[PDB]
């Protein structure tokens, strides 16, 4: 997440508000001074230095993380943007259109804008390219994993913040005393724009026993809930048949048309687009628009505010109308009891903001403040006729102090507890802290219980026993978080491999067409979705599509959802193919790939390097998130559930599921556990609260947290004299370095009532 | 769980742990027992807080 933020997101934030234009009017009493000036400051490429520190006297030198911890410094690096200055002049002739020209004052020029704190072992950090002997030279422990910041000497970890996913249509049942039966709401969000969140709620008024059940939507900047038919007519869809066609996609679904009949009877006398836009224009919350302009104002509400995640440009009213019909369709499907209400605790509908997106939004706010300060200083210099100094224009302390304050304190703004002091009691405690997540809790869901969708993504038994029980979650061992990719290549490939656009989609002529969703945006329909899903899966398994992209085919409701956004928690799984040579389903990974992996592993301790990405690129393994996990069948073990079918009474009873249609296999079930629970020997022979208690108390143990404790001046440090690796050990802790940095001793233990003491 | 087929109301599908603690839990049984233990811990914390309120 941090490498994605530094490599790509910083430039995106710079380019989103790069141009800053101040028009100085002529303000001429006489025609002698009829010249108008237009000063433009534009940011260009952003550059990041290696980590460094400037002292009091002004000498600046390369800063290494050992020195930043000892001297209570901040392990940060400088940001330098290219700024080009444009000065334009135009002859201010009234009536004549102004035509600006350059006066050839195009001076351009790296300028320092602030210090970004550098996560350790990231690509900008010095420790990423360092070998083991280099780390020992720098007095850094090679067992140290990075993933944290050094702010004023303190090691600060950013806890992953769990939020609801954006751009998803969620339908909920309201309470009985409420006049609304069901609400279909969407938190429309955009990434490549102003990053503003708009809530759109389509509500079915009236209870089941009531007869006048109408549907009204809550548009942004509109005080009253507009009826849906008026919104459809304001979106250019006047006739009632086309509105019900956009809402109800089956001509035989007469009950949904019955429940839509009071809606079309409600806004009946409004039969024009202009009348509907006037009706929306009456309820505008600005309350300052003249007679002829409210139409345009309503169009503004229907262009830049009503469902911004679809489009913000003009001429896209058909897609917004189809998506509104889709939301009403979902609402009425929940109202007709064809589908249940959306599970708010479903982990596929959640996103995890890691150090990338959190620093992304923080830097976006800080850079907006910096650009406002630049404009204010520039306006003050041109108005009060002072000289312009670029060193005074750009206050780098804004960016530097904002990042330093939001990382030193837990406060994320101007959300608390986002940044925490890294635990260094034991090595496993640090490992568990670096994979810790947090769910901020005022809803009617049940976020504290372990959900079904939490399988293989967060640890089933690793949570605090206190008020943070269930809200603080720890990732399982193989669980990862997607950093987000560009959906535009996937959209282009879909449009160029037979996805009909939504503009020319008629539901009655194409009743079997499958809706295609990319990041919650309905982009069109496909007549043959099985071939499309096969092509997309082959592209993802050969690496042409990024493996973090999730592709879900819901065959029942005829939907194809593609997610490329960040925050999705996925896990790797084996691929099970047809394998016609053996006549039955088999894993694509074979003994030859295993031999290549072990050859590479023992080379690491001359043949070709065969790594995890080699398995990923050959389609042997795949990344599956909780949304894609709903459409697959996973075998627990390869040698038991794949091949077609006396028993040891000591072994546990295990079923084979009596079904051979598997698409995936678990790599190992023990990877559902987190870092702390992987220390537990035989956790399947324990009661689950005891596993939770041990996952809590393993962080309080004593061991060797780092091998360079002699050169670290930590506030408190506890080191056992004689750590011992456990006699009973798990395979998983071989990857947790528990046999290298143990946290206990093998004591000869008698279970006896010896003395009553 | 994604390891079961749709509409499976068998005891092993919906959370019956046929194995003892001696024989060890299957991974599905392990996860279902983890859900039960998590519900127990949540109920314990909520009960303690509400009963402290009631007692005061």
């Amino acid at each position: 997440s941090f490498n994605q933020f530094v490599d790509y997101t910083l430039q995106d934030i710079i380019c989103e508000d790069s141009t800053l234009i101040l028009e100085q009017l002529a303000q001429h009493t006489t025609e002698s001074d009829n010249i108008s000036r237009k000063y433009e400051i534009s940011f260009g490429k952003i550059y990041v230095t290696k980590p460094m520190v400037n002292e009091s006297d002004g000498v600046t030198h390369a800063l290494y993380p050992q020195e930043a911890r000892l001297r209570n410094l901040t392990y940060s690096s400088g940001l330098f943007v290219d700024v080009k200055k444009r000065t334009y002049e135009a002859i201010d002739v009234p009536g004549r259109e102004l035509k600006y020209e350059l006066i050839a004052e195009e001076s351009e020029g790296k300028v320092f804008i602030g210090r970004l704190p550098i996560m350790l072992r990231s690509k900008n950090c010095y420790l990423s390219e360092a070998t083991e002997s280099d780390l020992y030279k720098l007095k850094e422990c090679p067992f140290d994993m990075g993933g944290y910041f050094i702010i004023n000497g303190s090691e600060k970890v950013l806890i992953a913040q769990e939020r609801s996913a954006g751009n998803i249509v969620q339908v909920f049942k309201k309470a009985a005393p409420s006049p609304i039966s069901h609400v279909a709401e969407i938190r429309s969000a955009l990434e490549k724009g102003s990053r503003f969140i708009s809530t759109l709620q389509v509500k079915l008024y009236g209870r089941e026993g009531s007869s006048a059940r109408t549907i009204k939507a809550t548009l942004p900047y509109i005080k009253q809930d507009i009826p849906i038919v008026i919104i459809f007519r304001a979106l250019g869809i006047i006739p009632d048949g086309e509105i019900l066609e956009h809402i109800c996609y089956d001509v035989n679904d007469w009950q949904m048309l019955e429940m839509l009949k009071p809606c079309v009877e409600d806004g009946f006398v409004i039969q024009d687009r202009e009348t509907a836009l006037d009706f929306i224009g009456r309820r505008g919350t600005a309350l300052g628009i003249k007679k002829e302009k409210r139409i345009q104002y309503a169009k503004d509400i229907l262009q830049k505010e009503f469902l911004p995640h679809i489009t913000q440009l003009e001429g896209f009213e058909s897609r917004k109308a189809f998506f509104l019909g889709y939301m009403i369709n979902r609402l009425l499907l929940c109202a007709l009891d064809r589908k249940d209400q959306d599970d708010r605790d479903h982990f596929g509908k959640k996103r995890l903001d890691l150090a990338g997106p959190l620093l992304a939004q923080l830097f976006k706010t800080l850079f907006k403040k910096l650009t406002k300060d630049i404009f204010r200083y520039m306006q003050r210099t041109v108005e009060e006729a002072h000289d312009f100094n670029m060193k005074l224009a750009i206050n780098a302390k804004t960016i530097t102090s904002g990042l330093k304050y939001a990382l030193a304190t837990g406060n994320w703004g101007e959300r608390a507890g986002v940044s925490q002091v890294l635990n260094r009691y034991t090595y496993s405690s640090t490992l568990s802290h670096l994979r810790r997540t947090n769910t901020p809790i005022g809803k009617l869901a049940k976020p504290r219980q372990l959900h079904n969708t939490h399988w293989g993504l967060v640890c089933p038994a690793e949570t605090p026993e206190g008020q943070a029980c269930g809200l603080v979650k720890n990732l399982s061992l193989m669980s990862c978080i997607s950093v987000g990719t560009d959906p535009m290549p996937i959209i282009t490939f879909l449009s160029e491999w037979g996805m009909e656009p939504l503009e020319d989609y008629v539901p009655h002529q194409s009743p079997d067409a499958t809706r295609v969703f990319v990041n919650g945006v309905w982009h069109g329909v496909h007549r043959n979705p099985a071939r499309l899903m096969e092509t997309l899966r082959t592209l993802r398994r050969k690496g042409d599509i990024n493996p973090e992209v999730s592709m879900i085919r819901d065959i029942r409701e005829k939907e194809l959802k593609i997610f490329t956004d960040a925050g999705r928690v996925y896990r790797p799984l084996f691929i099970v193919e047809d394998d016609e040579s053996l006549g039955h389903k088999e894993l694509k990974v074979r003994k030859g790939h295993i031999a290549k992996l072990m050859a590479t592993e023992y080379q690491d301790i001359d043949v070709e390097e065969y790594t995890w990405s080699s398995l990923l690129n050959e389609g042997l393994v795949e990344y599956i998130d909780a949304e894609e996990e709903e459409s697959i069948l996973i075998a627990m073990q390869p040698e038991d559930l794949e091949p077609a079918e006396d028993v040891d009474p000591a072994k546990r009873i295990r079923v084979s599921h009596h079904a051979t249609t598997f698409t995936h296999c678990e790599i190992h079930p023990s990877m559902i556990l987190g870092v702390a629970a992987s220390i537990i020997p035989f956790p399947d022979h324990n009661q689950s609260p005891r596993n939770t208690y041990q996952s809590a108390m393993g962080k309080q143990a004593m061991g060797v947290f780092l091998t360079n404790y002699n050169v670290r001046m930590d506030t408190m440090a506890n080191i056992l004299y004689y750590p011992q690796k456990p006699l009973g050990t798990t395979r998983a802790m071989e990857y947790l370095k528990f046999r290298e940095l143990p946290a206990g001793q093998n004591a000869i233990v008698a279970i006896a009532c010896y003395s009553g003491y | 769980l994604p390891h079961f087929s749709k509409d499976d109301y068998s005891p092993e599908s919906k959370g019956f742990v046929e194995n003892s603690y001696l024989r060890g839990l299957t991974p599905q049984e392990f996860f279902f027992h983890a859900m039960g233990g998590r519900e127990g811990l949540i109920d314990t914390a909520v009960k303690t807080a509400e009963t402290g309120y009631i007692q005061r």
Partner: peptide, 24 residues
């Protein structure tokens, strides 16, 4: 300070639950 997972109830601290239910 400290970071312990040994859950120690804050005593005489029912005002958390009092603020949970001030509406009847």
């Amino acid at each position: 300070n400290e970071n312990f997972e040994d859950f120690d109830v804050e005593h005489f601290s029912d005002e958390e639950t009092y603020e949970e239910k001030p509406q009847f």
